[PDB]
Structure 1
Amino acid sequence: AAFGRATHAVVRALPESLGQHALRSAKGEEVDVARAERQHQLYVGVLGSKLGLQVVELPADESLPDCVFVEDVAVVCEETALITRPGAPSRRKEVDMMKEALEKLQLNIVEMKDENATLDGGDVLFTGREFFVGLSKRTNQRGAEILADTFKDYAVSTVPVADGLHLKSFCSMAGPNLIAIGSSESAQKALKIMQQMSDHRYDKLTVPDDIAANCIYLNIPNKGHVLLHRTPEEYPESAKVYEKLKDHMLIPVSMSELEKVDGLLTCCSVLINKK
């Protein structure tokens, strides 16, 4: 029941079509798909081999170039799973296989069915106490409404999100009551709004690089308060911030290839606590 506790991780393999056909917010260097597969493999390795989570590895689908980013199609709170209606029409079929796995994991399933609603899981920050939901190009008010009705035990508050960003493009939970936050103008504004709307203030962990504010926090029983963060090779000055968390078990993980298509750390997994 402690924050960050998980027993299962759902992930999904990369399709070869990702390199050229995955959606991306900015034009940049070419995706090395073979290398991206290696980085994804190490990522899965940490969750399953090193941390002992039961990993469900969904097969890839070439017709769904973004299928690896499973975070966007499912939001899990306790034993309830909200199957989303992704903002990008090209990603909507990714829902089909996620519904399968979560039904097998025997969770209480709720699917976003309103044809006027959109929501990317990447726009959702669950602090352990409430939800913050980015209103972006991908997530609308109606999407936020459905999330609120699904997790009625929790308060849900919206935060404006600019351009091709998601809420977690510049923030994530780094521990209980602790929000990892970028230092950009956008990130600070979003944080101020979050702090202003919440019932409580949150502690924060400020990092110089927005992207490196996206990390994975895991409470692993009899092992540690684990934090998966971007490497010192990717973001040296942010890694130095994480390194000061003496009580955390720090695991640097590279996502350099998938970053080219806006794929960060939280984006590649759905974490579940199954009793």
Structure 2
Amino acid sequence: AAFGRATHAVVRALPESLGQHALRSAKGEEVDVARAERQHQLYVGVLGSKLGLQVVELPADESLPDCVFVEDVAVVCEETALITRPGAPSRRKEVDMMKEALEKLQLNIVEMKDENATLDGGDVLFTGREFFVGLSKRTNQRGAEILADTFKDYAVSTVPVADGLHLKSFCSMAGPNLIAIGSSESAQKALKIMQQMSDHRYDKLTVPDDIAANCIYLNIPNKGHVLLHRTPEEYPESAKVYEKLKDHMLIPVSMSELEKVDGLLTCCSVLINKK
């Protein structure tokens, strides 16, 4: 009932400098920055226009090429916001605008300040009853410690993440007590770690493409149990798996341009529930 409720979405415009200077783990086609802006506008359109969330759009900062990926700089649970200390040096000033937006939303703000701590919000899976935090190139144990202290109400457990991935590079919540999970060995080992550490186990939805396991679940009262998932023209066989959720309002949303710079669906928004 309560899980996935949101009233506000914080997003951030992307900068033109993204196409050229955004951190990129794997190299391939270049980014069509104009097209990426169109896909990002369609995505904000789903959140605000279609689903009715109050969207706070932060302006783009050319000096922060990754500023569109707001998920990495803030983790919000109930009324408290953890402003993170991103692993990547170039991203650290992205917290300034985030701090200001969340102040305006009157959230309890905690700023990660231990200079031995790093945490990327994309490494944080909040399941509704606990947190899993990936230990990765961007998030270390000290960062997980600070998250645990900030959200003392919830258990926090760490999961090793290999190869410059983030935890949510291959998983996300697809519904109450339901983890969407990739089929790779790494994704499957991560899940069994999470399952063994939890108080009690989660249901799972296995999708063939790891990247397609990153989706956005929203409880919009009197609209539906909404899932934004990658399109059938991006990942056809994963999209078909999501179709089995006959009780969900399924919304295909493309992220094909920003995926080139490791940008998935959860990365582009911070969802908040204001009562």
Per the shorter chain, which TM-score range?
over 0.9
Q: Deviations over 1:194-229 (max 9, x none)?
A: 001111100000000000000000000100000000
Structural mapping, 1:1-275, within 5 Å: 2-275=2-275
Q: Deviations over 1:224-250 (max 9, x none)?
A: 000000000000000000011100000
Following TM superposition, the consecutive aligned residue runs of length 4 or more in structure 1 with deviations greater than 3 angstroms are: none
Q: Deviations over 1:59-87 (max 9, x none)?
A: 00000000000000000000000000000
Q: Deviations over 1:114-135 (max 9, x none)?
A: 0000000000000001000000
Deviation at 1:262, TM superposition (A): 0.3
- Alpha-carbon distance between aligned partners in 2 of 1:244 and 1:56, rounded to the nearest angstrom: 33
> SS state of the match for residue 209, structure 2?
coil
Query: Structure 2 regions of 5+ residues with no counterpart?
Result: none
| TM-score normalised according to structure 2 size | 1.00
- Alpha-carbon distance between aligned partners in 1 of 2:25 and 2:194, rounded to the nearest angstrom: 24
- Alpha-carbon distance between aligned partners in 1 of 2:214 and 2:53, rounded to the nearest angstrom: 20
> SS state of the match for residue 187, structure 2?
helix
Query: Structure 1 regions of 5+ residues with no counterpart?
Result: none
- Alpha-carbon distance between aligned partners in 2 of 1:196 and 1:262, rounded to the nearest angstrom: 29
Deviation at 1:107, TM superposition (A): 0.3
> SS state of the match for residue 99, structure 1?
helix
Deviation at 1:164, TM superposition (A): 1.4
Number of positions where the alignment pairs a residue of Structure 1 with one of Structure 2: 275
- Alpha-carbon distance between aligned partners in 1 of 2:163 and 2:199, rounded to the nearest angstrom: 28
| TM-score normalised according to structure 1 size | 1.00
Deviation at 1:163, TM superposition (A): 1.2
Q: Deviations over 1:1-27 (max 9, x none)?
A: 610000000000000000011001111
- Alpha-carbon distance between aligned partners in 2 of 1:265 and 1:39, rounded to the nearest angstrom: 11
- Alpha-carbon distance between aligned partners in 2 of 1:228 and 1:181, rounded to the nearest angstrom: 15
- Alpha-carbon distance between aligned partners in 1 of 2:143 and 2:28, rounded to the nearest angstrom: 30
- Alpha-carbon distance between aligned partners in 1 of 2:26 and 2:246, rounded to the nearest angstrom: 36
Q: Deviations over 1:102-153 (max 9, x none)?
A: 0000000000000000000000000001000000000000000000000000
State the superposition RMSD in angstroms.
Answer: 0.5
